[PDB]
Design a protein around this ligand. Sequence first.
Ligand code: GDL
Ligand code: GDL
Ligand code: GDL
Ligand code: GDL
Lengths: 95, 90, 91, 90, 91
Amino acid sequence: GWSNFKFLFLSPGGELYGVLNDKIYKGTPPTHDNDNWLGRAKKIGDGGWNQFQFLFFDPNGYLYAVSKDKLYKAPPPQSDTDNWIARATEIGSGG
Amino acid sequence: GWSNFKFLFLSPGGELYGVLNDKIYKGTPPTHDNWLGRAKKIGDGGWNQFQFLFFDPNGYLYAVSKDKLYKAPPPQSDTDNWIARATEIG
Amino acid sequence: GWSNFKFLFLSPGGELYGVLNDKIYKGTPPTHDNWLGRAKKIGDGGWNQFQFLFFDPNGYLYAVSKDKLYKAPPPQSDTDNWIARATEIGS
Amino acid sequence: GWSNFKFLFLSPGGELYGVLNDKIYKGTPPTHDNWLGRAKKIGDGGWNQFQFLFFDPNGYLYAVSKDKLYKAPPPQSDTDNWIARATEIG
Amino acid sequence: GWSNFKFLFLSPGGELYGVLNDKIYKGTPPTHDNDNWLGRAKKIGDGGWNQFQFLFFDPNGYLYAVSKDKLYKAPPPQSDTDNWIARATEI
Ligand SMILES: CC(=O)N[C@H]1C(=O)O[C@H](CO)[C@@H](O)[C@@H]1O
Ligand SMILES: CC(=O)N[C@H]1C(=O)O[C@H](CO)[C@@H](O)[C@@H]1O
Ligand SMILES: CC(=O)N[C@H]1C(=O)O[C@H](CO)[C@@H](O)[C@@H]1O
Ligand SMILES: CC(=O)N[C@H]1C(=O)O[C@H](CO)[C@@H](O)[C@@H]1O
């Protein structure tokens, strides 16, 4: 169901991140063909991830994200209940 | 111009890779300079089929096509049938 | 609008690349209070001499001190001595 | 307010910058209106310390403070000011 | 000379503007050390320019003036007989 992901990208701590149906997941990349990645991935965000147009890491752990006019930089979401967009530092336009 | 690309991303060895009109190219990033003109074509078709394309820091290339995920060292040259030999990890 | 770009990504070297329409741009990633500085100190000493200090549309800097007008490109670092290479115009 | 501002200038991108009691605000030039009440406050504290505060054509903000000279992106840059400080390698 | 001006700034087009003693003047920037800028400068206002605390251009050549809590916008004056203050928009 990899073609159904909106984002699929990598942290510098080796975790694979993926945005699927407005949720975001993470986990080490699969190694074999029979590995079921979704089934061992941690869900670290439950709604609102599809709004984004770019979403990537720098090598220092920071997660960049573009939502329409705006660029955010912050450490990645840590759980389900971590409202990332609410605490992410806007560095984007002149907000 | 640059917008005709479907993918355009950097490898950790410092090389920019660009999917254009079904072919893939690589060459060092531009700084001032016609990139596409001095760029090595390293694939000759099949490259639009991908939804994602990305390097890990070890120099492995990741690719998603038709609900399948692939991993291997990047296409070496236009004679290299990458998708035929890349490892399905889906 | 950061969305206008079709491509937005980083270099191992720490630079931000953005493709916008047909062109590509290479620049410093934007940053998170304290302007102010830091950053960035472009000259040290001699600067409150001046009554006016302003730019050419071409990026040449003008300054007025003691009834004389001075012109030169701006210093790129605080080691660069400006007035010293600034030529005076107005007789 | 107008006569209470220390500084009142425009960026190469057409935004009006105002420094008032140690705070700097930006926002679209008036055309009429309550410019202050509806501006974005982009800095707080020490803004009155400068003797000069002005742009270069390329969107760098210059500042004179305590006999020294300073240069940086304005506080709270936007995308257009980024593109202008950027090297176009298109 | 220069230190007697209250305002001395550049239009987006490259012309130098200066307020000297309630009067305002314009002309291409001094080209050399010998050049007497005021001598050839075109007088573009003959009264009422000491009143301003700020006097500046935007990118499109509009001129702004601040005077007792009123801001004034309009294309710049062009001569002795151009009543700028009265045709300016009174923000
Ligand atoms: C884009 C974003 O930050 N989404 C988060 C959010 O809005 O708060 C939720 C908790 O209420 C999280 O589950 C979501 O991950
Ligand atoms: C997606 C992919 O692997 N494309 C390759 C392919 O189809 O085989 C060709 C050589 O036979 C290469 O030129 C292509 O680059
Ligand atoms: C007015 C002027 O140009 N002052 C410069 C100066 O005196 O030399 C120094 C470089 O050594 C610089 O720090 C100062 O900016
Ligand atoms: C501030 C201002 O606009 N002053 C003008 C004015 O009031 O009328 C005069 C001619 O009528 C001009 O010479 C002045 O420049």
